[PDB]
Design a protein around this ligand. Structure first.
Ligand SMILES: COC(=O)[C@H](N)Cc1ccc(F)cc1
Length: 330
């Protein structure tokens, strides 16, 4: 089996991407944020506190002939940005791009935090990290990918995120038309539950490549690229007037600037992030200070190759018995 679904940025900045997901029978289509940094498939639902729903599409298990309460199971999750949600659990049929899983744990929100409420375009999350991070208690549940893996033609999924444009998530096959050159594979540690890997270094603009090991995670549910403070300072030093603002919460730069590219290493290969990918626009409406797309990971405790990095590549999440990541230019 394979699946193929289009993923669409939620706004003009590529703050996140949403992918339609069919849940239940008859199908209820919700637009979920596919997140390679978490392991819960959770949705706004008929159970979500009414005051915490503002424009989302909800899953209503009572309208699904295939929904079953997973008796006694609860979930509660807290993300890196301080957002959170919690609730109870149903099993139901879930399809992505024509690939169907029966008996998938669908975590129904009773509570969502303000950031979720304030984002009308995201109906929930579909976690694609390792199932060891799934928060369901007392019986941990598997991700959609882990449940699909054994029906797939190949135990893989790929992320092909667009820059200010739609992209694709494929399951079970590698579209050799979707990238240029070859795919460079690199080792993964699953010890923390993430797609954790080690970049071989970086360059700023047309500068020399610095060979240095940068451990981090491939995380489609994080907008920006978070790297060590040394690396980030070296980048923003090439942008006249850029500075770290404690008031704004990161590096800002003059909106009149032209940003340099940023290159990261994957083994002996190189992925180039164009400068325009690093522009996240005015800090507030009408401001001439713009927010940077490369930020320090200091105090996060991990480096994060979020969408700014991943959208510059065709990314293979290889879920074979020994997982690996692959990156290709495109
Ligand atoms: C722990 O948070 C993360 O970094 C997730 N992988 C991405 C993520 C960030 C915010 C959010 F509301 C949902 C998901």
């Amino acid at each position: 089996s394979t699946g193929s679904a289009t993923t669409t940025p939620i706004d003009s900045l590529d703050d996140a991407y949403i992918t339609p997901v069919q849940i239940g029978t008859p199908a209820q289509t919700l637009n979920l944020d596919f997140d390679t940094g978490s392991s819960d498939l959770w949705v706004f639902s008929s159970e979500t506190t009414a005051s915490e729903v503002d424009g989302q599409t909800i899953y209503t298990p009572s309208k699904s002939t295939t929904a079953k309460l997973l008796s006694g199971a609860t979930w509660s999750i807290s993300y890196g940005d301080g957002s959170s949600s919690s609730g109870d659990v149903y099993t139901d049929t879930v399809s992505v791009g024509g690939l169907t899983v029966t008996g998938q744990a669908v975590e129904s929100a009773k509570k969502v935090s303000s950031s979720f409420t304030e984002d009308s375009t995201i109906d929930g999350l579909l976690g694609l990290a390792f199932s060891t991070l799934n928060t369901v208690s007392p019986t941990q549940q598997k991700t959609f990918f882990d449940n699909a893996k054994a029906s797939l033609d190949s135990p893989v999924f790929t992320a092909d995120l667009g820059y200010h444009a739609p992209g694709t998530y494929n399951f079970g096959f590698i579209d050799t038309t979707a990238y240029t050159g070859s795919i460079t594979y690199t080792a993964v540690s699953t010890k923390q539950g993430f797609w954790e890997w080690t970049s071989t270094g970086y360059a700023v603009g047309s500068g020399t490549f610095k060979s240095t090991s940068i451990d981090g995670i491939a995380d489609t549910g994080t907008t920006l690229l978070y790297l060590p403070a040394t690396v980030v300072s070296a980048y923003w030093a090439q942008v006249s007037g850029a500075k770290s603002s404690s008031s704004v919460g990161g590096y800002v730069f003059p909106c009149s600037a032209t940003l340099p590219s940023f290159t990261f290493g994957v083994g002996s290969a190189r992925i180039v992030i164009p400068g325009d990918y690093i522009d996240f626009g005015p800090i507030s409406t009408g401001s001439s200070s713009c927010f940077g797309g490369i930020q320090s990971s200091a105090g996060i405790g991990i480096n994060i190759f979020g969408d700014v990095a991943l959208k510059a590549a065709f990314v293979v999440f290889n879920g074979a018995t020994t997982p690996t990541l692959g990156f290709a230019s495109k």
